[PDB]
């Protein structure tokens, strides 16, 4: 079990397929930002990107030749926009999406590098930057941060990331092993919901 201050701690412990699943989840949640941008500026790349991301998800339960991975990253780079070459805001979330998928692909080649923490921060920043651009003009810093605290996009993003990480954290096979983890989490080392224990 992880307390209300232990999101980043579960994230920091993700490894193997669970880390990949978390990275792909962050990218999937961002994908329509890529599709919308590609459409808006008349690129015909939305469909090709959807396939590359589909393939990244399929790779979770398939062997893939290491030798094949650099070409996948190369394809991604050709679909990835340069933020300086487009004036519309939408290019920024489009680029952020590509960075998320890049991490998931790089992780297949170099799985031992930890990525989930920084990918999670990036995924949050996409939402914060968008709220700031769309609603923050003329606000003092402290007003903006009050907008952030109650903004539904940021409340939802936070709980999406946490739900995903925690679903992965508890997941086990078979069912019995899953229930043992859920139980252990509730038991909380013998410390109740009121912060007391029979120590």
Q: Which residues bind Na ion (CB under 5 A)?
A: 107, 111
Give the residue, chosen from 68, 139, 159, 177, that forms a contact with its own copies under the rule CB under 8 A. Answer: 159
d(CA 186, CA 188): 5
- Residue 33 within binding range of its own copies, rule CB under 8 A: yes
Least Å distance between CB 132 and its own copies? 12
Binding residue (CB under 8 A) for its own copies from 12, 51, 60, 177? 60
Given a contact cutoff of 8 angstroms between Cβ atoms, the answer to whether 20 and 175 are in contact is: no
| H helices present in the chain, as ranges | 7-13, 17-40, 46-59, 69-79, 91-109, 116-135, 141-150, 152-170, 175-187
Distances (CA, A) of 27 to 46, 119, 135, 181: 14, 9, 24, 28
Binding mask 160-179 for its own copies (x = CB under 8 A): x-xxx-xxxxxx-xxxx-xx
Does the footprint of its own copies cover residue 150 (CB under 8 A)? Answer: no
The CA distance from 97 to 88, in Å, is: 16
86 binds, among its own copies, Na ion, none (CB under 5 to 8 A by kind): none
Binding region for its own copies (CB under 8 A): 1-5, 21, 24-26, 28-33, 35-36, 39, 46, 57, 60-61, 93, 123, 126-127, 130, 152-153, 155-160, 162-164, 166-171, 173-176, 178-179, 182-183, 185-188, 190-198
């Amino acid at each position: 079990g992880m307390n209300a201050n232990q999101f980043l701690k579960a994230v920091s412990q993700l490894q193997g397929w669970r880390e990949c699943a978390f990275l792909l989840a962050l990218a999937e949640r961002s994908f329509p930002n890529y599709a919308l941008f590609a459409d808006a500026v008349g690129l015909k790349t939305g469909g090709k990107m959807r396939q590359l991301l589909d393939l990244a998800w399929d790779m979770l339960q398939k062997d893939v030749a290491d030798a094949a991975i650099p070409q996948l990253l190369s394809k991604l780079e050709t679909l990835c926009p340069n933020v300086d070459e487009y004036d519309a805001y939408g290019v920024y979330p489009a680029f952020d999406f590509c960075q998320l998928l890049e991490q998931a692909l790089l992780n297949r080649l170099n799985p031992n590098k930890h990525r989930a923490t920084e990918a999670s921060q990036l995924a949050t920043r996409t939402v914060m930057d968008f709220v700031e651009m769309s609603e923050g003009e003329g606000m003092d810093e402290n007003e903006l941060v009050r907008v952030f605290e109650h903004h539904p996009l940021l409340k939802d993003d936070k709980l999406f990331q946490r739900d995903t990480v925690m679903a992965l954290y508890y997941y086990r096979t078979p069912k019995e092993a899953f229930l043992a983890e859920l139980r252990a989490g509730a038991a909380n080392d013998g410390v109740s919901n009121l912060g007391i224990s029979l120590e």
